Amino acid sequence: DLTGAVSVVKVDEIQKQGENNPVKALQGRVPGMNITADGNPSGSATVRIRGIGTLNNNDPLYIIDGVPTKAGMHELNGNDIESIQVLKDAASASIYGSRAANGVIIITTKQGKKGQIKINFDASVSASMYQSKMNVLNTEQYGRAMWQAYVNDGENPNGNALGYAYNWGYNADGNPVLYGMTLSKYLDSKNTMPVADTDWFDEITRTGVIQQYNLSVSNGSEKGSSFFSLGYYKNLGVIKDTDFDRFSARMNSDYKLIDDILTIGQHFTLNRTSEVQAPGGIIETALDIPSAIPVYASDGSWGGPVGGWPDRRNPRAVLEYNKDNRYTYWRMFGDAYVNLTPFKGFNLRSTFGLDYANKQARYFTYPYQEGTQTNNGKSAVEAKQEHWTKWMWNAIATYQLEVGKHRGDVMIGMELNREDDSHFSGYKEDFSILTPDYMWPDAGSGTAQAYGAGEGYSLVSFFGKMNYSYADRYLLSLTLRRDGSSRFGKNHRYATFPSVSLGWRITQENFMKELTWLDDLKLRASWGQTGNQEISNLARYTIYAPNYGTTDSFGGQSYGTAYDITGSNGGGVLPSGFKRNQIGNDNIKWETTTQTNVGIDFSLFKQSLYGSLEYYYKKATDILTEMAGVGVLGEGGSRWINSGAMKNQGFEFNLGYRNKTAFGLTYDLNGNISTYRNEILELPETVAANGKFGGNGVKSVVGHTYGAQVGYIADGIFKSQDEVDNHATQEGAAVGRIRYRDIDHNGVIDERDQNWIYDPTPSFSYGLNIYLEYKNFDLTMFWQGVQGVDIISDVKKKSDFWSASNVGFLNKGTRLLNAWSPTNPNSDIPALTRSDTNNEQRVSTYFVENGSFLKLRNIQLGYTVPAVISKKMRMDRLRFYCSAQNLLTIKSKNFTGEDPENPNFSYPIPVNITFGLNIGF
Amino acid sequence: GKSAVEAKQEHWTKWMWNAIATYQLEVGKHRGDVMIGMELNREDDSHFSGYKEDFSILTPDYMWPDAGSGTAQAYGAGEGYSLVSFFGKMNYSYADRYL
Amino acid sequence: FSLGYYKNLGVIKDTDFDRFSARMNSDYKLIDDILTIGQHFTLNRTSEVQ
Amino acid sequence: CDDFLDRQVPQGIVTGDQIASPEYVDNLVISAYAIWATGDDINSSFSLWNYDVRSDDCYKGGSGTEDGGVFNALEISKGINTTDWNINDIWKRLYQCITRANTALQSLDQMDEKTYPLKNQRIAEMRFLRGHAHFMLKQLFKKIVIVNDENMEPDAYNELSNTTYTNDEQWQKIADDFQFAYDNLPEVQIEKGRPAQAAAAAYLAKTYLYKAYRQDGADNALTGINEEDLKQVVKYTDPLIMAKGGYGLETDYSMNFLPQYENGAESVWAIQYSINDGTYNGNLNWGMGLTTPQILGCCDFHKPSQNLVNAFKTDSQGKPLFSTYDNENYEVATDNVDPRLFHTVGMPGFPYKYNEGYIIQKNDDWSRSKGLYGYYVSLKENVDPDCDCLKKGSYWASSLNHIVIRYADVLLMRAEALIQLNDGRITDAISLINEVRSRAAGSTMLIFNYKEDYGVNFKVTPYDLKAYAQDEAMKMLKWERRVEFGMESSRFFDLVRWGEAKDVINAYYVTEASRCSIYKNAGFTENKNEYLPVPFEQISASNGNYTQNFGWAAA
Ligand SMILES: OC[C@H]1O[C@@](CO)(OC[C@H]2O[C@@](CO)(OC[C@H]3O[C@@](CO)(OC[C@H]4O[C@@](CO[C@]5(CO)O[C@H](CO)[C@@H](O)[C@@H]5O)(OC[C@H]5O[C@@](CO)(OC[C@H]6O[C@](O)(CO)[C@@H](O)[C@@H]6O)[C@@H](O)[C@@H]5O)[C@@H](O)[C@@H]4O)[C@@H](O)[C@@H]3O)[C@@H](O)[C@@H]2O)[C@@H](O)[C@@H]1O
Ligand SMILES: OC[C@H]1O[C@@](CO)(OC[C@@]2(OC[C@H]3O[C@@](CO)(OC[C@H]4O[C@](O)(CO)[C@@H](O)[C@@H]4O)[C@@H](O)[C@@H]3O)O[C@H](CO)[C@@H](O)[C@@H]2O)[C@@H](O)[C@@H]1O
Ligand SMILES: CCCCCCCCOCCOCCOCCOCCO
Ligand SMILES: [Cl-]
Ligand SMILES: [Mg+2]
Ligand SMILES: [Mg+2]
Incomplete structure (x- = not known):
């Protein structure tokens, strides 16, 4: 669209980040499009366009070669993409589908230019290194902080039933001082577990290796065209025993018959990926486990806590036990189309898309036993299978005309979509040989479970779009859809979404021609609506499930319906029944997002200074909310309601300067900047008290930003008994503790x-x-x-x-070595205690920090061997290069951790340093 | 009154790789193809299935393993083989009348 | 490039078979017909009640 | 256009309309039992032990005061916020059990009795369950919502209130449920998980026993002891009703807490935990998954207090040391003791659930607190480590039944209401207390040789049948309830029935500070801490329809 808010991505920049997922290589390249990603080797990523659209699903929609798909991109070969435009407003987005409410991204893959036969071999290798690593007490430091904690509370630090003994006394002032410190050699009496100074993050990390190869080949005839690529990725993440890889093939081709009036074409890509993923919570486990616990126990077993040592698993052992939990994922993606042009300007076209993936995996449960961390002796395997089969069908009629100065596109069409999913798995316990070779369900001698279910939805869509241009200086555009979904009843099936955009090519009107210095200026405004139906396939219904209770829980609360009504104590099938999962709602309808947008493109000083501004107001109404039930309503009282509204407004600015220089240096800058506000407007009563989208279940987020949070205000530290007795009554308050503000002034x-x-x-x-x-x-x-x-x-x-943790004696950060005391009174860090008397775990400003950052996402330096040398080996282009991603991070002095982009426990974001090459005949 | 369902899955994954060197010549009346080459093959199979007994509604819409109230069984195993091959083939024709 | 469909309801009731088929083959002659790349590929989905 | 968007339909579920069919009526009934086994978790056991840490019987245990901080707050009565996640949690879970009762009742109401002859016994079963939950919510929160309209629409739940009824008539609406159950349940249940009519009577009685100590004022103090209510406790603990169902005290105390002896004569109604039963790891008592000692790696919760330990001390004639018991620790060599101590509290140097091969010590290997919470283990819910019944899922749990009403409870509840109705039947209530006390004195199977191997001096004797004053008789029943129901999570609930909470517990806080240092800053605030606050999120969603309990600020 020349009338909508459309960010157009320079695809040649993408391949310079060596990224597997191209979407990950747009991180920061588009204003309005926030792309987030941890460092896991898939390069999987999250996209949010223009704030936070709705309260269910905010993921965008891709149209790859006219086929809609809402998820993947790291599953396909990023390397055979030709073009990417991001459509941010509703006028431009809407015509592309009924799932456009969160923006849409148009991807077209490479074809073959006519009369041209090229080939392209790109290749690359990288080392991947853990960078921002968290500083964590060592064995000696652990013993110092512990003595401090004991002493501050005035307990005998020799009473730590770990291995420490302390030689300490009192200085002249009377505050306690530590002189020397001895550690036992074994953590247990029976000497099964030596004392270590293990650096656990060093132990679970490694130098990653990335590989990348891609070949592509194309051909162009008057009568047709054809394209063919093969690609491979492989990335051993910086966390040990985690890796990802992808094999890719793509064939596209088209054929022009009769008089270029019957045209047949096909796009198709085939991909096989496979991955072993990092377990839930290893970073936190690595943070948590004390240095004193050795990697290996006396006998060569895995090391573990014993005696008084905390309830924390061995993080190296976890990763090793999870190394064969590999899934294998085959995705087939493509379409075929026919195009008829029965006379000048008239086109009929029909596309059938297919999107089909299947995922296989055995997940193994090996028996563990790290000190007191035990598993009994459980061994099991689960063979898991899943299929996702989506297909799309549309027919399209379009007319074009050019009357002297009038221009005009019209288009009406129809689209069908259908997804059908299935998944199932067989689970078996108890194996005699504990390897992936033995651990198949046929070979277990214990209890079995079987799992699985299906689901699906369908969409129907009727649409038309009308473009008009007057004298190539005034542009009007009109979009209109009626959109049905199987996820609603007949009484609310469809909904109708119009869109209007206007465009005013200022400079081509004569009274601006008196300005040699501005080549185009175009003001555009747009209004339009988009439906949203992205909800549970079962959303309409009252759901009872048999849920006998065959499934892993945690600490009980399986909520199963089986019961030993007879009192036999079991041994055989129990009688069971049904439990409510969800209350229905006869009258759920489409959620609606309405967007108003205005912006201006510009080009100055002979195409050398270009860019565009963007302002939008974006409101979601009748928002489809999974709404909790009132407490007394009880089991499965939730229901999907249209009940809620949310705004996003903001500005988006692109500005690029380009020009060369008279000593041989071309320089091309193009930057961008944006800002937005988000406000929740209305919200069901029970979601407001819920905290689900905001204020912690103490205040209602209505009127604040999505995910805003509420807490106590920390006002420094009580530094003197004076300051406690003069403060409001605060349970657990004492010298060294956090002073929390008395906001209501009630004493x-x-x-x-x-x-x-x-x-x-x-x-x-x-x-x-x-x-x-x-x-x-x-x-x-x-x-x-x-x-x-x-x-x-x-x-x-x-x-x-x-x-400030549920469990005593965990490993701690290295900052608390600086904790306030009489000894050390120049500190913000609360004095070390052994009991959270003051409940400084409460949400408070103490934990909010400035997470602002500037990052050198990428730097690449290339040499391309000059033509005359290379052409003589028959190579249009030969180029070597070398680059580094996420090389440098600038951050606030007030941020106390390592990565402000990944401040807690997500997969660390490594620094990559890369070498590679480009050969093309 | 037995009711049960078995969700069954099987994969067969075979791949082949070869490299081939061939020479041709035509000397007046002599003809002659030569060819040497190498070939690798590998199949890897897997199959597994979850079995569940006892369903309250007796249709394919209901009869998924998650919804059974009786005994379960899990099945499956893998297997595979590989082949290596080295070969050459020599064609000769004399005067287009003896081969 | 081909697309194909079969469907056959056998003479024994409640037994049927069908197949969807696509095939793309292509080749490319580069340099002086001295570097040649090619590809054959067929994709099929069948389903049956026996 | 139309046929296309209807083809795909919900897979693997029963829909709302379908559920009402008669073919599913007994499915719903079973499901309403199941949730008492499958609806609690390690912090919400429907035994309510996590909340009896408020009592003088026990400490919360664990790693330390932060190991479930909200329950330490409860244990010391300080820093409880109405926004606390546990308080919300248990409120929510108990009303979930209520759902399954009412859903089954909604189905059962429409059934035709000519063709479903047990229609009213099933209906009674469900109404028994509904009373069970409401009863426990009433103990926990005082000001509760009464949810007993099984045909009530979802939306009508939004306009309910926890003050629709006065406190007394809240209690009566519970009594109504257990009454109908009495009128309708069969005398005997061949399927032992189903309550028999005596169970309905016992819970009926228990409901009037809690109703009779009235709090009809605006705060929580006693406003007089009603004797129409007390007279019901008599009616519905009549030994003639109990014999029609065959209930009575086991010939040895330990049987109520042993896997081999489930569903005995004393087990009036229990939660039927089970193993090897088709579920992932079994329908085990996950709710007690925290209270296993360190011998199993984790987690050492629910540890008894030295207060409770010393309470089993007895004078030289085998009677409680009413005034002196807590002035010196129980000492094995020189003190006379009640056999029930060794069925309640596993103590250092002594066997863990009657197994000479597991002797408890003041060790890493038994307690987790480095001494903070002591070195005692809760015996009633744990089991022999060798037991067939014991499995580890995410926690260690067993299939040992949780008994909601022991028949000892029925005798001591009768004893109580008689003593409170000063009406000449006190020498009967004494003879009830001696039923329990004499049974207990002889419960030395499985610990018969503790005299010669460890030196203990068992000495317990019944009270002489005199014409006791009502004040003195009360303290003899109270003392029997101390030793008989120790660590069974109704001790603190007793004190709030008696209006004695602030006195006895604030006192406990000073006597026990010496042994468990967490009570240093503990303080019970009367007309406040006798009941958990109604949860903040619950009030806040009600839009003013819910009312907070007395003593808590307008938040
Ligand atoms: O701040 C309050 C906040 O917490 C929530 C959510 O956690 O609580 C409500 C909700 O949480 C549950 C269960 O999820 O209870 C949590 C609660 O239970 C307590 C007592 O109240 O006791 C827990 C005890 O269990 C242990 C056992 O750990 C075991 C031993 O077998 O060792 C391994 C490793 O820890 C575990 O897999 C085993 O079960 O701790 C479990 C407990 O510990 C936590 C701490 O984060 O997990 C440790 C994990 O974190 C890692 O560092 C990274 O993943 C890993 O090392 C490890 O996997 C917590 O997540 C787990 O629940 C033992 O330590 C304890 O003695 C409390 O300690 C604990 O807080 C429900 O019952 C309850 O309803 C929120 O809703 C609320 O806002
Ligand atoms: O119908 C299943 C339903 O579950 C989801 C998540 O709720 O995915 C299931 C599952 O896959 C996640 C992992 O698979 C990968 C591999 O490509 O991605 C699959 C797609 O799923 C997304 O997350 C949806 O946007 C997207 O990223 C992928 O296209 C990995 O990237 C994922 O980590 O999640 C389970 C693990 O939690 C696992 O057992 C399943 O395979 C939905 O995606 C899906 O609709
Ligand atoms: C070049 C790719 C073109 C793909 C379109 C042609 C189809 C080739 O095989 C795909 C078959 O999938 C069709 C959808 O599946 C039909 C199943 O529906 C019936 C059972 O639910
Ligand atoms: Cl329904
Ligand atoms: Mg205040
Ligand atoms: Mg049992």
Whole structure:
């Protein structure tokens, strides 16, 4: 669309990040499009376009070669993409589908230009290194902090029933001082577990290796065209025993018959990926386990806590036991189309899309036994299978005309969609040989379970779109859809979504021609609506499930319907029944997102200064909300209601300067910046008290930002008994403890003294791509910043306290070595205690930090061997290069951790340093 | 009154790889193909299935393993083989009348 | 490039078979017909009640 | 256009309309029992032990005061917030059990009795369950919502209130449920998980016994002891009703807490935990999964207090040391003791659930607190480590039944209501207390040789049948309830029936600070801490329809 808000991505920049997932290589490149990703080797990522659209699903929609799919991108071969445009407003998005409410991304893959036969072999290798690693007490440091904690509370530090003994006394002033410290050699009496100074993060990390190869080949005839690529990725993540890889093939082709009036074409890609994923919570386990626990126990078993040591698993052993939990994923994606043009301007076209993946995996349960961390002797295997089969069908009629100065596209069409999913798995316990070779369900001698279910939905869509241009200077555009979904009853099946966009090519009107210095200026405005139906396939219904209770729980609460009504104690099948999962709602309808947008493109000084501004107001109404039930309603009282509304408004700015220089240096900058506000407008009563989208179940998020949080205000530290007795009554308050603010001024510090203390929305984010060519060399940098963001740190709970955790004696951050005491009175860090008397675990400003950052996302330096040398080996282009991703991080002095982009326990974001090449005949 | 369902899955994954070197010549009346080459083959199979007894509604819509109230069984195993091959083939024709 | 469909309801009741088929083959002659790349590939989905 | 968007339909479920069919009526009934086994978790055991840490019987245990911080707050009466996750949790879970009762009743109401002859016994079963939950919510929160309209629409739940009824008539609406159950249940249940009519009587009685100590004022103090209510406790613990069902005290105390002896004569109604039964790891008592000692790796919760330990001390004639018991620790060599101590509290140097091969010590190997919470283990819910009944899922749990009403409870509840109705039947209530006390004195099977191997001096004797004053008789029943029901999570609930909570527990806080240092800053605030606050999120969603309990600020 020339009338909508459309960010057009320079695809040649993408391949310079060596990223597997291309979407991950747009991180920061598009204003309005926030792309988030941890460091896991898939390169899987999360996209949010223009704030937070709705209260169910905010993921965008891809149209790859005219086929809609809502998820993957790291599952396909990023390397055979030709073009990517991101459609941000509703006028441009809507015509592409009924799932457009969160923006849409149009991807077209490479074809073959006519009369041309090229080939392209790109290849690359990288080392991947853990960078921002968290500083964590060592065995000696552990013993110092412990003595401090004991002593502050005034207990005998020799009473730590771990291995420590302390030689300590009192200085002249009377405060306690530690002189020397001895450690036992074994953590248990029976000497099965030696004392270590293990650095656990070093132990579970490794130098990753990335590989990448891609071949592509194309051919162009007057009568047709054809394309063929093969690709491979492989990435051993920096966390040990985690890896990812992908094999890719793509064939596209088209055929022009009769008189280029019957046209047949096909796009198709085939992919096989496979991965072993990092377990849930290894980073936290690595943070948690004390240095004193050795990797290996006396006998060569895995090391583990014993005696008084905390209830924490051995993180190396976890990763090793999970190394064969590999899934294998085959996805087939493509379409075939026919195009008829029965006379000038008239086109009929019909496309059938197919999107089909299947995922296989055995997940193994080996028996573990790290000290007191035991599993009994359980061994099991689960063979799991899943299929996702989506197909799409549409027919399209379009007319074009050009009357002197009038222009005009019309198009009406129809589209059908259908997904059908199935999944099932067989589970078996008890194996004699504990290897993946033996551990198949046929070979278990214990109990079995079988699992699985299906589901699906269908969509129907009728649409038309009308473009008009007057004299190539005034443009009007009109979109209109009627959209039905199987997820609603007949009485609300369909919904109708119009869109209107206007465009005013200012400069082509004569009274601007008196300006040599501005080549185009175009003001555009748009209004339009998009439906949203992205909800549970079962959303309409009252759901009873048999749920006999065959399934792993945690600490009980399986909520099963089986019961030994007879009192036999079991041994055989019990009688069972049904339990409510969900209350239905006869009158769920389409949720509606309405967007108004205005913006201006511009080009100055002979195409050298270009860019565009964007302003939008984006509102979601009748929002489809999974709404909790009132408490007394009980089991499965939730229901999907249209009940809720949310705004997003903001500005988006692209600006690129390009020009060469008279000593041989081309330089091309294009940066971008954007900002937005998000507000929840209305919300069901029970979701407001819920906290589900906001204020912690103490205040209602209505009127604040999605995910805003409420808490106590920490006002420094009581530094003198004076300051406690003069403060409001605060349970557990003493010298060295956090002073919490008395917000209501009632003279008591209690649950009423909390306030809006957290907002996830930045003041603004921005990106910037510097490019230089000089003497066959080239240099790229990409910088990305987010400015003004609050983060909530849960590491700070582990770094700044001895007892802000559920369990005593865990490993702690290295900052608490600086904790306030009489000894050391120049500190923000609360004094070490052994009991959270003051409940400094309560949500509070203490954990909100400034998570602003600027990151050198990428820097690449290339040499391309000059033509005359290379052409003589028959190579249009030969280029070597070398690059590094996420090389450098600038952050706030007030951020106390390592990665402000990944402040807690997600898969660390490594620094990559890469070498590679480009050959093309 | 037995009712049960078995969800069954099987995969067969075979791949082949070869490299081939061939020479041709035509000397007046002599003809002659030569060819040497190498070939690798590998199949890997897997299959598994979950079995569940006892259903309250007796249709394919209901009869998924999650919804049974009776005994379960799990089945499956894998297997495979590989082949290596080295070969050459030599054609000769004399005067287009003796081969 | 081909697309194909079969469907056959056997003479014994409640027994049937069908097949969907696609095939793409292609080749490319580069340099001087001295570097040649090619591909054959067929994709099929069948289903049956026996 | 139309046929296309209807083809795919919900897989693997029964839909709302379908569920009402008669073919599913007994499915719903079973499902309403199941949730008492499958609806609690390690912090919400429907035994309510996690909340009897408020009592003088026990400490919360665990790693330390943060191991379930909200329950330490409960244990010391300080820093409880109405926003606390446990308080919400248990409120929510108990009303979930209520759902399954009412859903079954909604189905059962429409059934035709000519063709479903047990229609009213099933209906009674469900109404028994519904009373069970309401009863426990009433103990926990005082000001509860009464949810007993099984045909009530979802939306009508939004306009309910926890003050629709006065406190007394809240109690009566519970009594109504257990009454109908009495009128309708059969005398005997061949399927032992189903309550028999005596169970309905016993719970009926228990409901009037809690109703009779009235709090009809605006706070929580006693406003007089009603004797129409007390006279019901008599009616419905009549030994003639109990004999029609065959209930009575086991010939040895330990049987109520042993896997081999489930569903005995004393087990009036129990939760039927089971093993080897088709479920992932079994329908085990996961709710007690925290209270296994360190011998199993985790987690050492629910540890008894030295207070309770010393309570089993007896004078030289085998009677409680009413005034002196807590002035010196129980000492094996020189003190006379009640056999029930060794069925309740596993103590250092002594066997863990009667197994000479597991002797408890003040060790890493038994307690987790480095001494903070002591070195005692809760015996009633744990089992022999060798037991067939014991499995580890995510926690260690067994299939040992949780008994909601022991028949000892029925005798001591009768004893109580008689003593409170000063009406000449006190020498009967004494003779009830001696039924329990004499049974207990002889419960030395499985610990018969503790005299010669460890030195214990068992000495317990019944009270002489005199014409006791009502004040003195009360303290003899109370003392029997201390030793008989120790660690069974009704001790603190007793004190709030008696209006004695602040006195006895604030006192406990000072006597026990010496042994468990957590009670240092503990303080019970009367007309406040006798009941958990109604959960904040619950009030806040009600839109003013719910009312908070007395003593708590307008939040
Ligand atoms: O801040 C309050 C906040 O917490 C929530 C959510 O956790 O609580 C409500 C909700 O939580 C549950 C269960 O999820 O109870 C949690 C609660 O239970 C307590 C007592 O109240 O006791 C827990 C005890 O269990 C242990 C056992 O750990 C075991 C031993 O077998 O060892 C391994 C490793 O820990 C476990 O897999 C085994 O079960 O702890 C379990 C407990 O510990 C936590 C701490 O984060 O998990 C440790 C994990 O974190 C890692 O660091 C990274 O994943 C790993 O090392 C490890 O897997 C917590 O997540 C687990 O629940 C033992 O330590 C304890 O003695 C409390 O200690 C605990 O807080 C429900 O019952 C309850 O309803 C929120 O809703 C609320 O806002
Ligand atoms: O019908 C299943 C339903 O479950 C989801 C998540 O609720 O995925 C199931 C499952 O897959 C997740 C992993 O698989 C990968 C591999 O490509 O991605 C699959 C797609 O799922 C997304 O998350 C949806 O956007 C998307 O990222 C992928 O296209 C990995 O990236 C994922 O980690 O999740 C389970 C683990 O939690 C696992 O057992 C399943 O395979 C939905 O995606 C799906 O609709
Ligand atoms: C070049 C790719 C073109 C793909 C379109 C042609 C189809 C080739 O085989 C795909 C078959 O899948 C069709 C959808 O599946 C039909 C199943 O529906 C009946 C059972 O639910
Ligand atoms: Cl329904
Ligand atoms: Mg205040
Ligand atoms: Mg049992």
